[PDB]
């Protein structure tokens, strides 16, 4: 078994994978491109999507949240227990024209010096008044600035159809004749101000099969010892994985040698008797629901 | 290919798949089986595992522990760690532990001792494995409060608020990397791709290349990617630089399926 031959086939599959993922038939031109280094807005965007926090390639764009001295803070005021992050939807629509195009939207915050557990919640601004809890995070202390990332795809999709819309990141509240715990009485929560202020990172579209097989324990295996279930849908994977560019169903991982294999499995709980006490055991990965070439 | 021949072979493979998952050489002797129907306590426990609600190779044993004796603003659930120590006998055997429970308008709940969930109008399940791990180390309980928002307007702060429970547990009973040139297992192997050197490609401006890697090795069944990572790239169309993200480009680990 020659790993050097596998590398050869892996490499040629890479060539096809990248072109097909970009829905190109052949690599594009250049020379209309000037020489030297990329613009820093491009590098910032590219760096943003490499920061750590469907088949076809997504265009990546970035829209930074409106600067904090505009009408932010004309009304509700930034703080250390609550931060406010507003976005010009016309700029969002500039980066992703129609909402159907959006595939993922991430809200990115650069967290500061932290030295105690802060539990924070993300809220969306609505009508013109109220808020909807979106999600929360439990942040371990750290003396290193780390980026936070929140998935806000559904919200941004709506914005892509108001004109100024915002988020709020606040502190959590314990609720229990009712008692409440407070954080906001000591002394900016996360980075606002500057060109590492919060931004929306946007990904958008631009402008071998599972085969049914039912196993009956008695009928197929002569097995009486399993009292439940009487049978189950094991199913299985079969069909070729060959190699315009389909590539998306035949070799989407660009293996040197794709195989039809289970993509998603799920368990099978059984009831049977060991000695004469009943057991209930969960067997992992017994049922094939989908297959893929990989 | 005859699909019927492969069906014949999957069927005979299920025979050994089930038995080796149970670490059994042959189906257990059933000449001592208590006759007739099976205990409804057992069936209720089977029912609870089979059905799901808002949410390793070898067979894990399944055990359930109900709750002992409040509002519609909070629900307090207690269990004695005695009764749970009888289910999972030693704490390191614990594979997973779920808490089970059973409206007109949205409401938003919280678990303290953790997680929280939003319930839609019309059971329920919470993963509490780590909390139930240490409880097996004497009486502990769970907090299901309601959620509240708080913020600051002037000097003004504001707050707003809008078959018994059961603990289901699974337990065990009482990834390769190659750098060698040796093929003995299925493993991820290193492979660096240089766009210019390997493909003759000058049009990708940022990543000069990347560690694509690949899977390879025998399995007692193919060696395939388990975890992949995306690759972002920068190139120009016309005078326009573009950032694109490509999924499933980098193999980080391999499995056999």
């Amino acid at each position, epitope marked *: 078994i020659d790993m050097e031959l596998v590398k050869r086939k892996r490499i040629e599959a890479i060539r096809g994978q990248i072109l097909s993922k970009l829905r190109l038939a052949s690599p594009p031109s250049q020379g209309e491109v000037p020489p030297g280094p990329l613009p820093e807005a491009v590098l910032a965007l590219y760096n943003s999507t490499r920061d750590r926090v469907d088949y076809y390639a997504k265009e990546v764009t970035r829209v930074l949240m409106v600067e904090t001295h505009n009408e932010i803070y004309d009304k509700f005021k930034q703080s250390t227990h609550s931060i406010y992050m507003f976005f010009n939807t016309s700029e969002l629509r500039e980066a992703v024209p129609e909402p159907v195009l959006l595939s993922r939207a991430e809200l990115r915050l650069l967290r500061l010096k932290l030295k105690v557990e802060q539990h924070v919640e993300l809220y969306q601004k609505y009508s013109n008044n109220s808020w909807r809890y979106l999600s929360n995070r439990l942040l371990a202390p750290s003396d290193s600035p780390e980026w936070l990332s929140f998935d806000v795809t559904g919200v941004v999709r709506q914005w892509l159809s108001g004109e100024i819309e915002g988020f709020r990141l606040s502190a959590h509240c314990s609720c229990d004749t009712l008692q409440v715990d407070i954080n906001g009485f000591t002394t900016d929560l996360a980075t606002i101000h500057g060109m590492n202020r919060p931004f929306l990172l946007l990904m958008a579209t631009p402008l071998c099969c599972v085969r049914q097989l039912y196993i009956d324990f*008695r*009928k197929d295996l002569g097995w009486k010892w399993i009292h439940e279930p009487k049978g189950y849908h094991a199913n299985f994977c079969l069909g070729p994985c060959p190699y315009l560019a389909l590539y998306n169903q035949h070799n989407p991982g660009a293996s040197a040698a794709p195989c039809c294999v289970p993509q998603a499995l799920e368990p099978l709980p059984i009831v049977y008797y060991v000695g004469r006490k009943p057991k209930v055991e969960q067997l992992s990965n017994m049922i094939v629901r989908s297959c893929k070439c990989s | 290919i005859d699909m*019927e*021949l492969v069906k014949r072979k999957r*069927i005979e493979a299920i025979r050994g798949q089930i038995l080796s998952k149970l670490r059994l050489a042959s189906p257990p002797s059933q000449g001592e089986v208590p006759p007739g129907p099976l205990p409804e306590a057992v069936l209720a426990l089977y029912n609870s595992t089979r059905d799901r609600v808002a949410g390793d190779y070898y067979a894990k044993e399944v055990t359930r522990v109900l709750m002992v004796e409040q509002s519609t603003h909070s629900i307090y659930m207690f269990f004695n760690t005695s009764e749970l120590r009888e289910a999972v006998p030693e704490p390191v055997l614990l594979s997973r532990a779920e808490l089970r429970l059973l409206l007109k308008v949205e409401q938003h709940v919280e678990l303290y001792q953790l997680s929280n969930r939003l319930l839609a109008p019309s059971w329920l399940s919470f993963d509490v494995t780590g909390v139930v791990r240490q409880w097996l180390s004497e009486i502990e309980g769970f907090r299901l409060s309601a959620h509240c928002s708080c913020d600051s307007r002037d000097n003004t702060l504001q707050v707003d608020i809008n078959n018994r429970p059961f603990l289901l547990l699974m337990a065990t009973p009482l990834t390769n990397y190659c750098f060698s040139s040796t093929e003995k297992n299925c493993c991820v192997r290193q492979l660096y791709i240089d766009f210019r050197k390997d493909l003759g490609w000058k049009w990708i401006h940022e990543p000069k290349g990347y560690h694509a890697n690949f899977c390879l090795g025998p399995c007692p069944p193919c060696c395939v990617p388990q975890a992949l990572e995306p690759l972002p790239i920068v190139y120009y169309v016309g005078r326009k630089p573009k950032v694109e993200q490509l999924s499933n480009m980098i193999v980080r680990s391999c499995k056999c399926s």
Partner: antibody
Amino acid sequence: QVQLVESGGGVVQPGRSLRLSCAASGFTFRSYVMHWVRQAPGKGLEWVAVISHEGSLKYYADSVKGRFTISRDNSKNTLYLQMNSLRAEDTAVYYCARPRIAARRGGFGYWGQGTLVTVSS
Amino acid sequence: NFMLTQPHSVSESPGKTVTISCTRSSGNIDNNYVQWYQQRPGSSPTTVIYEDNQRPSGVPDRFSGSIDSSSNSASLTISGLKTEDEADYYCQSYDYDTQGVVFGGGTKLTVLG
């Protein structure tokens, strides 16, 4: 396509022995378990015997156990049945049958045309 | 092995529907899949139902298989009877204690003419 042609049926003095053949075309005969089934004039089908595709494993009905022997040879894609100490009871049309996944699951997917053996004097 | 008992014969008029029963003598009918073969005189048999209720391609939906656990039997049902359905029908199952294949005695179906 998928076909099973049998030969060697005939008339045999009672205590003697024939060997039926069943040549197979249209499929990888090597991979398949194979069966023999028989039918006495006017009476039902009667499963006779089976072999694994390798040789190896053989099972028989009680009615023929000590007497009949199955064999196959994959190099000729041909299944055989050495019958021993024939009787008028064994007078029947003999079919070779290929199972559908397994006889116990989906029965027999294909049959030969049959050869008649009549055991008389 | 166990026994599968079918009626010696059934008959019905053309267009009508008829059922052929296949009773198992011992052990639960649900222990094993039941198969149904059609055999025309002179022909070798062919499948009309397998795995209790599945039709091979080209077998019309007038042929259906079913199982009555309450009476430990399998039933072949043929609707819209046509002259061509006249044949002998065999059920077939498996035992697991004899590792053997068991056939019913067969039923002659007459389409009344």
